[PDB]
Structure formats: structure tokens, C-alpha cells
Design a protein around this motif. Structure first.
Motif, mmCIF file in Angstrom:
data_model
loop_
_atom_site.group_PDB
_atom_site.id
_atom_site.type_symbol
_atom_site.label_atom_id
_atom_site.label_comp_id
_atom_site.label_asym_id
_atom_site.label_seq_id
_atom_site.Cartn_x
_atom_site.Cartn_y
_atom_site.Cartn_z
ATOM 1 N N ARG A 39 0.836 -1.188 0.000
ATOM 2 C CA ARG A 39 0.000 0.000 0.000
ATOM 3 C C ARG A 39 0.874 1.242 0.000
ATOM 4 N NH1 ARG A 39 -5.692 0.774 0.485
ATOM 5 N NH2 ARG A 39 -6.053 -1.255 1.479
ATOM 6 N N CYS A 40 0.633 2.127 -0.962
ATOM 7 C CA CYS A 40 1.399 3.359 -1.058
ATOM 8 C C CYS A 40 1.366 4.111 0.264
ATOM 9 C CB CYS A 40 0.851 4.233 -2.180
ATOM 10 S SG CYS A 40 1.482 5.911 -2.181
ATOM 11 N N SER A 41 2.458 4.812 0.562
ATOM 12 C CA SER A 41 2.618 5.402 1.885
ATOM 13 C C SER A 41 1.568 6.469 2.158
ATOM 14 C CB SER A 41 4.023 5.979 2.025
ATOM 15 O OG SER A 41 4.963 4.947 2.254
ATOM 16 N N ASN A 42 1.332 7.366 1.202
ATOM 17 C CA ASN A 42 0.381 8.454 1.394
ATOM 18 C C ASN A 42 -0.939 8.238 0.661
ATOM 19 O OD1 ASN A 42 1.321 8.794 -1.167
ATOM 20 N ND2 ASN A 42 2.215 10.820 -0.845
ATOM 21 N N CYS A 43 -0.889 7.932 -0.635
ATOM 22 C CA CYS A 43 -2.117 7.717 -1.395
ATOM 23 C C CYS A 43 -2.922 6.553 -0.841
ATOM 24 C CB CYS A 43 -1.786 7.473 -2.861
ATOM 25 S SG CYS A 43 -3.105 6.731 -3.819
ATOM 26 N N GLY A 44 -2.252 5.464 -0.478
ATOM 27 C CA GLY A 44 -2.943 4.262 -0.069
ATOM 28 C C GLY A 44 -3.381 3.378 -1.209
ATOM 29 N N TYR B 117 6.009 3.949 -2.528
ATOM 30 C CA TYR B 117 5.154 4.853 -3.278
ATOM 31 C C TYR B 117 4.619 4.163 -4.520
ATOM 32 C CZ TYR B 117 7.297 8.444 -0.405
ATOM 33 O OH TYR B 117 7.733 9.199 0.658
ATOM 34 N N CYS B 118 3.405 4.526 -4.910
ATOM 35 C CA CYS B 118 2.936 4.193 -6.242
ATOM 36 C C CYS B 118 3.597 5.121 -7.250
ATOM 37 C CB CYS B 118 1.415 4.300 -6.328
ATOM 38 S SG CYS B 118 0.715 5.840 -5.705
ATOM 39 N N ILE B 119 3.455 4.790 -8.530
ATOM 40 C CA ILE B 119 4.105 5.584 -9.568
ATOM 41 C C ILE B 119 3.527 6.991 -9.604
ATOM 42 C CG2 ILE B 119 4.325 5.809 -12.054
ATOM 43 C CD1 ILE B 119 4.279 2.397 -10.411
ATOM 44 N N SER B 120 2.217 7.111 -9.397
ATOM 45 C CA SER B 120 1.577 8.420 -9.395
ATOM 46 C C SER B 120 2.159 9.318 -8.312
ATOM 47 C CB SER B 120 0.071 8.253 -9.204
ATOM 48 O OG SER B 120 -0.430 7.203 -10.012
ATOM 49 N N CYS B 121 2.174 8.840 -7.068
ATOM 50 C CA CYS B 121 2.650 9.676 -5.974
ATOM 51 C C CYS B 121 4.154 9.878 -6.040
ATOM 52 C CB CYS B 121 2.241 9.083 -4.631
ATOM 53 S SG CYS B 121 0.556 9.496 -4.179
ATOM 54 N N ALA B 122 4.898 8.881 -6.515
ATOM 55 C CA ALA B 122 6.325 9.082 -6.730
ATOM 56 C C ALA B 122 6.568 10.239 -7.687
ATOM 57 C CB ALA B 122 6.965 7.801 -7.260
HETATM 58 ZN ZN ZN Z 1 0.289 7.160 -3.824
#
Ligand code: ZN
Ligand code: ZN
Lengths: 135, 33, 197, 90, 97, 97, 221
Positions: free
Chosen positions: F21-26, F73-78
Motif C-alpha cells: 500500500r502506497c505510503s500516502n495515497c494508499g 510509493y505508487c508511480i503516481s505519488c512518486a
Molecule cells: Zn500514492
RNA sequence: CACCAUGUUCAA
RNA sequence: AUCCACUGCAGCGAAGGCGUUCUGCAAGUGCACGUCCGUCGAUCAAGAAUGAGAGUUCGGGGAGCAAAGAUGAUCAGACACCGUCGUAGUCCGGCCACUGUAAACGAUGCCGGCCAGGCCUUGGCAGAGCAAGAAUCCUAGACUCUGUCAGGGCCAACGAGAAAUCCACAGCCUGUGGGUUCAGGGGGGAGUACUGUCGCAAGGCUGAAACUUAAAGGAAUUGACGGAAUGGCACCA
């Protein structure tokens, strides 16, 4: 009033600092943690909902808790910093360095420093679905 | 983007519209027989 | 009854004799089994031993609710209780009942180790009215059951009306006299149960 | 020849009571009527006498267990848990 | 625990003498023919004890098979059951060795 | 138009990889597709290190405790929080920092 | 306003630790029928070994002491648990190694039941060229059996006081990392955590003069 | 990381 | 309920998939070998067994999350994103429950032969080494080097390709034939209708035509644009 000890001693309380992204707790208690002495949040020192996590509100909160713990008789603080942790975020919020500086400059001696962010060996499903908080 | 030009709406959603159409049809023919 | 019973023969306490007691059967209990009853009995299926010699995971049936009482709990088909915890400070014990409740009973209450036999019988849908006829014909005069909306107002608080209906809330109070205590007696809630109970 | 397709022992019920109920009673009645394995003599001989009573026609054993099948599943797990609890508090 | 008993039993049934059954085993024990008595684990406790007593009288060895009468028969090559097994002539089996 | 030889992920010889699970986005992202960075910070930055060490007893510079985070991180949030930046077609083959 | 109804008690540590007078704890005073002694009876304190022994070489170890009896302003704490610090073991764990964990529930022959979780990490030889230094699964099973019997031979057949003394003098970790080199060399073998699950009857005089020796420091008041 | 929808037909 | 960190150009499994520790049960691959058999093999319509998640069925469970729903914002609208709850569901068991689909992907059928170089890595086997705790002894499943078999990759010639790219193949192809299975024939209509068969259902498999249309499409290029990034700049900012 306060405790009685020899001249060259330090009375140690423990200061839990809960620095989430929405607020900031400064919480001085007995070493047991069982007996709260004084706790002040970043939302007791500001008007806006935003500023509950501002570095200034945390400064004022750690101040106003340091004066009262001195009033009670505590001279040093074992510090226990904490982020929301669990599933939310293991990164400490903004009003953490400011709480530390507030206590240190105000005059409390600082013993140990710690990170007690709750973390999981494995966790419950985080909030937000598979796609997360789309923004 | 990740795909090239559906010449209509999203293939998943028109697949879903077709499924809804198909079971409306199924109910109309179950009326008769 | 749904569970089979067991004639179990012991010796007489003080007479030259054989006392044949009768207890609800444990699942797996067979004829000629040598069950054991007492404080120094072993943790074997069918044995009857105090609720204190039982570790904190034991599955018990024929459970007593009082000391020197004789098996008043967990007695129906496939019924079993689970010994949750013991307290030596009081000599008592928390047990989880088939109802899902947690009852505290003294650790001198005797249970029987295992399940109650004849389990799985509600997992067959009675297919006919005659099956339930024969079912209740040996229990008591309670079947069939006329519903109160189908009666006349002389016979039930629900009867009468030009449409079969209850004109008032079904949830009746607990202090309701005997005679208007029909419907849902002191119901804390109503409707479909979803989520938690 | 084969006399039914889906209906099994539930041919006695004919057309009544609903397909989804005849399904469950078939699963139950096959076992209620079948001969089960005797773990004593090693022969498939346990006949259900009454509800919860099973008599072995070869060994002569008489056992208490199961409304429709000799051993319920909870019985087979209770035996194991009781065994391991006794093993540990030997 | 080693499991070559089920393998030596194949050798016994190939070449050698066995007695399948409670009465055959008791007859071998009454005479001096038996060299080993294998017993299914599910055997009646009373017949188990009786055969173990006959074996301690005959100074014969007993082996608890860790199988049923079904498994004892199957190991013998049989489509019936057997609670006891007497091994009269090992042949080439090499069990007690 | 396959953009990456490893199709955005390091999955090779696997069929399925745990979803983290992405750290911030989830967002649920495969464990190998995620942009993951084990970061070590300090409880205190040099904007406060002197002010705290002057009031400490058991600490000083080069002595304060650290934070060990492992942000995934996911690619979006990265890409948004600029943990990673879009690179040239030729500089995409660079795999060492 | 709330401090007016509170006393302070000195928290006195067992015989193993050099420093005894610590942790002036608070409690509401007595109003007759209810006293504060049973309010302090069980008041677990997490206290660093760097402060219990005044040496910074051990400052990476929290010890949780449970209050068991009070005398005047001296409440007697006994051993209840111990653990590393999050900083410590998170610095210990690095990537390309393999961590071996072991957990045991043992008896100290005093009746105390102890959980012992030990953590170790595989080690790079100095001439090593590869990046892995990964252990195999059979190798780790063997290392874990060694860990198990070492931790046993250490804590059982030794009273809880000597067990705490070993945990201070971390001999279990060194014994394990020494015996490890035959299966896979380990590094930073430390007891991550130790907990007291089940403790026997109290025996207050025993608590007074065996885990302490008396010598209760001057309870300032 | 408030919110920021649209652009008649052929021709170029 | 779930097993963080360790956790990876790592391993295993036919695929789906598989991560705390001890343990029961059967299994597989690889390697080693003057072991046995002696062609018993390859691919496969029909048939059969597994098959994520969703969904259904019967009995439990329900922490967390969460379709529907409720509800506060945002908005022109906003039963959307955002926020607070919340039901089914997600968890367990079942005649060996049913279903039988996924971007089930490597968008790459399987068996066999040959295919330059360099690098990393997994498991053996072989031969070496200055190569390892407590000690200093002593050996040691660690480490280094070499070879080889099996596996997982990376980058670099020829060749191939429409190109992107492939590279133990997507090469050996108009200089076209090792063997075998499946599928396609412009775009739509349409994976639709009807029929058949399986299923409790949802639906799966099977599967057209009338009619319509000159392009759909693929890779790559130059410019334009971006509520994309980086770096310069302007008082028509
Ligand atoms: Zn994210
Ligand atoms: Zn029998």
C-alpha cells in the motif's frame, strides 16, 4: 508543590509528542505514563482548524506544558515522539521539531529520545480502496 | 492514457450495457415462454 | 429429545450394588466404554471431572451450573461449552456456552468431556408438515400454531380487522400483563440482523 | 440403467417441497441410509439405529454420534483438541 | 520409526509361511511354529492381551503394526482383514534380523 | 510500444507478487512496481540539533537517534512528490543512483 | 489544582542494577478506606539500562520494572520485561543480509515464565565479493535450533535474577554468534525482547531481601 | 494537489 | 483479520498462486552415477483435473476496509472525485459446495537442433585457496577462484523486423519444408440474435446474418499542445 530530593538531582517525567498531520499533542506524564501531569494540544492554542498542526501551535503547546510541568516539579523529560502510525503514516508531522525545540529552549533537560510510532508486524486493510485517495 | 482510441465508449461499459440489454431481452422472452 | 442417552452403571457408594445412572451421551461414547468420574479422572472424552482439572481450551458438555448440581448446561444435540479461563482466587471459571454467552461458574462444577451426540439434525430441512407433527407429538401440545392475525379480537390482541394486520407496534413491553404480552416481548431491536448481533 | 439425473434418493418426494430443499435432504439422506466405516473392526457396517445411535452389524459395537453421519466434523476436531490438551498436561 | 516391516511382509508372502487370523496365530503360538506375531493397532484389547500373554509364554516376539486389520491384510496382499499375523517361516524376509 | 523491457516492474520468474500500500495515497501497488526508498533521518535536524544537545544529558552531535522509514510509493505519488522524474528514452536504462 | 492531593514515591530497582533511587512517581493520596499502595501495586516503568547502570555502552536497552510492594515512599520494582530500542534494532536490520529470529517460552526455575525473542543477522566475510551473504533455509533451521538450545541452557536452571544479569551482560548473544560460524556467521545477535508471562505467588519478604538486599536508598520526602 | 465545462458545416 | 522491516533483475509451482515460528502428511525439479527398462516418445479435436478477484449456495464470524445506501462538502449541477458512517462482501467450514471467467500477459503454443562476446545471480557436483568462533588448539554447512549441469536475468556482433525492438530468439524465411496443436482474413453490426449444451442464478462455452462503411489499425517521424518535468526570461508579467 513538588517532590523532595537531594540538591544535585533531576526529576524525570516522560513527554509523549504525538505529531500527526492534523494536530500535535504534547503530553507530560510520570515515568509510568499512568499518571498524566499536563497535556496540551496544538488545537488549544489556535483559532483555525488548519493551524492545529502548525509549527507555531506546537511551540506554544510545548511551552505551556513545560511551564506547568516545572510548576509541578519536573525538571527533565524522557521524550517519546510518535506519528499516527499503524496504517496511516509512519512519518512524524510538522509540529514535532518545534515541540522539541520549545521544550529544550524553555529549559527542560532532555534525557532519552525515542520513536514510539505504532508499526505493524502485519496490518488491517488501510483506509481508501485499491486506488487510494485520488486527488 | 494506456490504450489506443476506443472508437466508442469504454469497452467495459459497453460490454456492461450489452449484458443489461441481454437480460432485459431474456426477461421479455420469459414472459412469452 | 434429540440427543441419545446413555445408561452408565457405577458401583454403589456404600452398598453392594450397581447404580445405573442415565446421562446425555457424549459423541463417540460407545457401549462398554469405561467412563471415569471424579477429581483425579483423566482428560478423556466422556470422563466427568471438575471444572478445575480442565485446561483453558477444553470442550465440555453436560456442564453443571452449581456445585453438587447434576448437568444442567449444554445438553442438547451437538451442544458443547468451552472452558475459557480459571480463577484460583475465587475457585471459579469462565466458560463459553453454546448460546455464545460467557458464564462464570465455580470450578467445582463437573462437566463431561466432549460433544453431545446426535449433532447435525437442524441441518436437515423438515420437508413435510407430518415430520413436525411426529416431532412435537412426543414433546408437547404446541403444533400447529395459529397466528394471531388470523384470530378474532376476542381471542388475541392481533385478531380481527378487515385486513389481517396488527394495528399497533408488535414490540410489547416487559411489564405488559399476561394477556397483552404477545408479539415481540421487550425487543431491544427488530428487523433484519446485519453486521453485528 | 440409470433412473435419475439429479434427483437421487429424493425420488420419493417426487415433485414436492422445492428443488433446493430436496438437494439438502438428498445430501443428508444418502449418509443417513449408507453404511459407515467401523474404526474398530475395519468394516463398513455402522447402520443408523436412531438419531445419534449407530450399531455395527459386524463388530456389534454401538456408538453415539451424528444425526445423519456416524462422525460429525466437530467430533473429529474435538477428539484431536482433547487429545493434544491431554498430551500437554500429562 | 522405520517402515520396512511392510516390505519384509511382501517377502514373507512371496516365500515363507504366515498365518493370517486370530485362530491361526493362536494355533502357531500353542505349537512352537511362530517366530513373530504382528498385531493390527485396532484389534480388540482383550484379544490383544490374550495374544501378548500367549507370546510371553511362548517366548515369542510381538510387533504392533501401526495399521488396521485392513492394512495388515493389504500388506499381506489380501482383500480381507486380519488382526493377527503369525510368521512361521521367514524365508528370505529378514525381519527379526 | 512496450515502454520498458521489464514492464514497469522487477517481476521475473514470479507469477504473483504481494501488493503493498502506497505510503500516502494508499494505493495497492505490486511490491516490485512500487518506488520504494528506505530513508534514514534524525529525530532532530541541524536547525535544532545544537539547541537540543545543549539541553541534553546523554546526547550530543553525532549521537542523536535516527528514523528508519522505508517509504513505498505508487508511480503516481512518486512522480508527483518528485521522488522520481520522467527521464529520456536513453536515460531510462540507468539503474544505479 | 490536582497536585494538591498527590504524594511522590521513590521507585527502587532490584539488586542487579547499580542505580536504585529513580522515578519519583505520583499518585493520589489516601482518603481512608482506599489507599494508594494498591494503586501503585503494578506500575510498570520503562527505564533505560544506560540510566540503570550509568554506562552508555548499554543505553540501547529498555527494561520494564513492575511495582510489587511499597514501604513508606519506596516502591519495590521487580523485573517484568526488557527490550531493545526501535532505533537500535532498526539500525541493526539492513537489507542484503538474512535475519534469523527465535522465540522461546521457558521457566527460570523460580516459576517465572519468560518469552525470549532473539534477533540475529547473517555476516559478510572480509574477503567476500558477492553482495548476498544470504543464508539457506536449512542453514537457518540449524541456526535456530542452536539458538533455541543456547537460550534454554542459559535461562533455565538459573533464577530470574541471574537471567536479568545475563541479559545485561549479553552473553547469550555472543554465545550464539560464536556458535553460528559453523552454520552461517551471525552478527548483532541480541535479545530483541523478553517478557514475563506468568509469575508465581508474591512472597513479599522474598521480594524485599532476595531481589533486593534491603539497602533501600534514602527516600527523600 | 479549492474549483478551471465548451468551441456549428465544407474549405486551408 | 494480516504476517512489516529482512523482501531482492531472489526461489518454488502446470498455471492461478505461494512469506512469523515448531510440527504431521505426501510430492516435485535439479544434481551425482559403469543402477534398471529398452523406444515405452512429441503435439493433441473429444474428454478430465486445477483455475486471481468478483458472483452464487448452506452454516458460522465480523476487527479493519468497503459496492449499495446514508451523509457533509465541492460544483452551474455532482445520489462523482474529497470527508464521516455503513450493508452485502472480503475471513472460516462444505457431497472433494457451485461458477469457470481476468491486461488469466511475456499481449510471445509445445517438443527438438544450431546461435559471437561480456556481466550478475540461484541450486548442486568436481578441483583448488593466503579462507572463518571460544583459544592459541582443533575442525566447521561461511568466504574466494576455476570447471561443469540445471535455472533466473542484464548489456552486445551477425541475423531478423514496418519499426519499436528481439537476442538461450520475435535469428537460422521468396536461398521459403524438423514435428505438431490452436487461432486470423478490412472496419462495424458483434461476441449480437436464434439454437444447442453446462449453471441455483449471474452467466460460461458455441455462435451468425440482414444491413452499413473506405478506411479502422500498427510502428516511427516533424511540429503544436499539455491544469507534465527541468532550466532560462519579460514592467506589452
Ligand atoms: Zn500514492
Ligand atoms: Zn464394527
Amino acid at each position: 508543590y513538588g517532590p523532595q530530593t537531594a540538591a544535585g538531582d533531576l526529576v524525570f517525567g516522560v513527554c509523549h509528542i504525538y505529531a500527526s498531520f492534523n494536530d500535535t499533542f504534547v503530553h507530560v506524564t510520570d515515568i509510568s505514563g499512568r499518571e498524566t501531569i499536563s497535556r496540551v494540544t496544538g488545537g488549544m492554542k489556535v483559532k483555525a482548524d488548519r493551524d492545529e498542526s502548525s509549527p507555531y501551535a506546537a511551540m506554544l503547546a510545548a511551552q505551556d506544558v513545560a511551564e506547568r510541568c516545572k510548576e509541578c516539579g519536573i525538571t527533565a523529560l524522557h521524550i517519546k515522539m510518535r506519528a499516527t502510525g499503524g496504517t496511516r503514516s509512519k512519518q512524524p508531522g510538522p509540529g514535532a521539531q518545534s515541540a522539541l525545540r520549545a521544550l529544550a529552549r524553555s529549559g527542560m533537560k532532555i534525557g532519552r529520545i525515542e520513536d514510539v510510532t505504532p508499526i505493524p508486524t502485519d496490518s488491517t486493510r488501510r483506509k481508501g480502496g485499491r486506488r487510494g485517495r485520488r486527488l | 492514457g494506456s490504450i489506443s482510441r476506443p472508437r466508442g465508449m469504454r469497452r467495459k461499459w459497453r460490454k456492461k450495457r450489452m449484458k443489461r440489454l441481454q437480460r432485459r431481452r431474456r426477461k421479455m422472452r420469459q414472459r412469452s415462454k | 429429545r434429540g440427543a441419545p442417552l446413555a445408561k452408565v452403571q457405577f458401583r454403589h457408594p456404600y452398598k453392594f450394588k450397581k447404580v445405573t445412572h442415565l446421562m446425555v451421551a457424549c459423541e463417540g461414547m460407545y457401549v462398554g466404554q469405561y467412563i471415569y468420574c471424579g477429581k483425579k479422572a483423566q482428560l478423556a472424552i466422556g470422563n466427568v471431572l471438575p471444572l478445575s482439572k480442565m485446561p483453558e481450551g477444553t470442550i465440555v458438555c453436560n456442564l453443571e451450573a452449581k456445585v453438587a448440581d447434576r448437568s444442567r448446561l449444554a445438553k442438547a444435540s451437538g451442544a458443547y461449552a468451552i472452558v475459557i479461563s480459571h480463577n484460583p482466587d475465587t475457585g471459579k471459571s469462565r466458560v463459553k456456552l453454546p448460546s455464545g454467552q460467557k458464564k462464570t461458574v465455580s470450578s467445582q462444577c463437573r462437566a463431561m468431556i466432549g460433544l453431545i451426540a446426535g449433532g447435525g439434525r437442524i441441518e436437515k430441512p423438515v420437508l413435510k408438515a407430518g415430520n413436525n407433527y411426529y416431532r412435537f407429538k412426543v414433546k408437547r401440545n404446541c403444533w400447529p400454531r395459529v397466528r394471531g392475525v388470523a384470530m378474532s379480537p376476542v381471542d388475541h390482541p392481533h385478531g380481527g380487522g378487515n385486513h389481517q394486520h396488527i394495528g399497533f407496534p408488535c414490540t410489547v413491553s416487559r411489564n405488559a400483563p399476561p394477556g397483552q404480552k404477545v408479539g415481540l416481548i421487550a425487543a431491544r431491536r427488530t428487523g433484519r440482523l446485519r453486521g453485528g448481533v | 440403467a440409470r433412473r435419475t439425473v439429479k434427483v437421487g434418493i429424493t425420488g420419493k418426494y417426487g415433485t414436492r417441497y422445492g428443488a433446493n430443499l430436496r438437494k439438502r435432504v438428498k445430501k443428508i439422506e444418502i449418509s443417513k441410509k449408507a453404511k459407515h466405516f467401523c474404526h474398530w473392526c475395519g468394516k463398513f457396517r455402522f447402520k443408523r439405529q436412531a438419531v445419534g445411535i449407530w450399531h455395527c452389524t459386524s463388530c456389534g459395537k454401538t456408538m453415539a454420534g451424528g444425526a445423519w453421519t456416524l462422525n460429525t466434523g466437530n467430533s473429529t476436531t474435538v477428539r484431536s483438541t482433547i487429545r493434544r490438551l491431554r498430551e500437554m498436561t500429562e | 520409526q522405520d517402515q520396512n516391516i511392510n516390505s519384509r511382509l511382501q517377502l514373507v508372502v512371496k516365500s515363507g509361511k504366515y498365518c493370517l487370523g486370530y485362530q491361526s496365530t493362536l494355533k502357531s503360538l500353542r505349537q512352537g511354529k511362530s517366530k513373530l506375531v504382528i498385531i493390527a493397532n485396532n484389534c480388540s484389547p482383550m484379544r490383544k492381551s490374550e495374544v501378548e500373554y500367549y507370546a510371553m509364554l511362548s517366548k515369542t516376539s510381538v510387533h504392533h503394526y501401526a495399521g488396521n486389520n485392513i492394512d495388515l491384510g493389504t500388506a499381506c496382499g489380501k482383500f480381507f482383514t486380519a488382526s493377527m499375523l503369525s510368521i512361521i517361516d521367514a524365508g528370505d524376509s529378514d525381519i527379526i534380523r | 510500444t512496450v515502454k520498458r523491457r521489464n514492464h514497469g516492474r522487477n517481476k521475473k520468474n514470479r507469477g504473483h507478487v504481494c501488493g503493498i500500500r502506497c505510503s500516502n495515497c494508499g494505493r495497492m501497488t505490486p511490491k516490485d512496481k512500487a518506488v520504494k526508498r528506505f530513508i534514514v533521518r534524525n529525530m532532530v535536524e541541524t536547525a535544532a540539533v545544537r539547541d537540543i544537545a545543549d539541553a541534553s544529558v546523554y546526547y550530543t552531535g553525532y549521537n542523536l537517534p535516527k528514523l528508519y522509514l522505508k517509504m513505498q510509493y505508487c508511480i503516481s505519488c512518486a512522480i508527483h512528490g518528485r521522488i522520481v522524474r520522467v527521464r529520456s528514452v536513453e536515460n531510462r536504462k540507468i539503474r544505479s543512483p | 489544582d490536582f497536585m494538591t492531593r498527590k504524594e511522590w514515591y521513590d521507585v527502587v530497582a532490584p539488586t542487579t542494577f547499580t542505580k536504585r533511587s529513580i522515578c519519583k512517581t505520583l499518585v493520589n493520596k489516601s482518603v481512608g478506606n482506599k489507599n494508594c499502595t494498591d494503586n501503585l501495586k503494578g506500575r510498570v516503568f520503562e527505564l533505560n539500562l544506560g540510566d540503570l547502570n550509568e554506562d552508555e555502552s548499554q543505553a540501547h536497552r529498555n527494561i520494564r520494572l513492575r511495582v510489587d510492594d511499597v514501604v513508606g515512599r519506596n516502591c519495590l520494582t521487580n523485573f517484568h520485561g526488557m527490550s531493545l530500542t526501535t532505533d537500535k534494532l532498526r539500525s541493526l536490520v539492513r537489507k542484503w543480509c538474512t535475519l534469523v529470529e527465535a522465540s522461546m517460552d521457558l521457566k527460570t526455575s523460580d516459576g517465572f515464565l519468560l518469552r525470549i525473542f532473539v534477533i540475529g543477522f547473517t555476516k559478510r566475510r572480509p574477503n567476500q565479493v558477492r553482495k548476498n551473504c544470504y543464508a539457506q533455509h536449512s542453514q537457518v533451521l540449524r541456526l535456530r535450533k542452536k539458538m533455541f538450545e543456547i537460550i534454554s541452557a542459559a535461562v533455565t536452571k538459573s533464577d530470574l535474577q541471574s537471567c536479568v544479569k545475563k541479559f545485561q551482560l549479553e552473553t547469550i548473544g555472543k554465545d550464539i554468534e560464536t556458535a553460528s560460524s559453523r552454520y552461517y556467521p551471525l552478527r548483532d545477535v541480541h535479545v530483541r525482547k523478553v517478557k514475563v508471562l506468568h509469575l508465581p505467588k508474591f512472597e513479599p519478604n522474598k521480594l524485599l531481601q532476595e531481589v533486593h538486599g534491603g539497602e533501600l536508598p534514602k527516600s527523600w520526602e
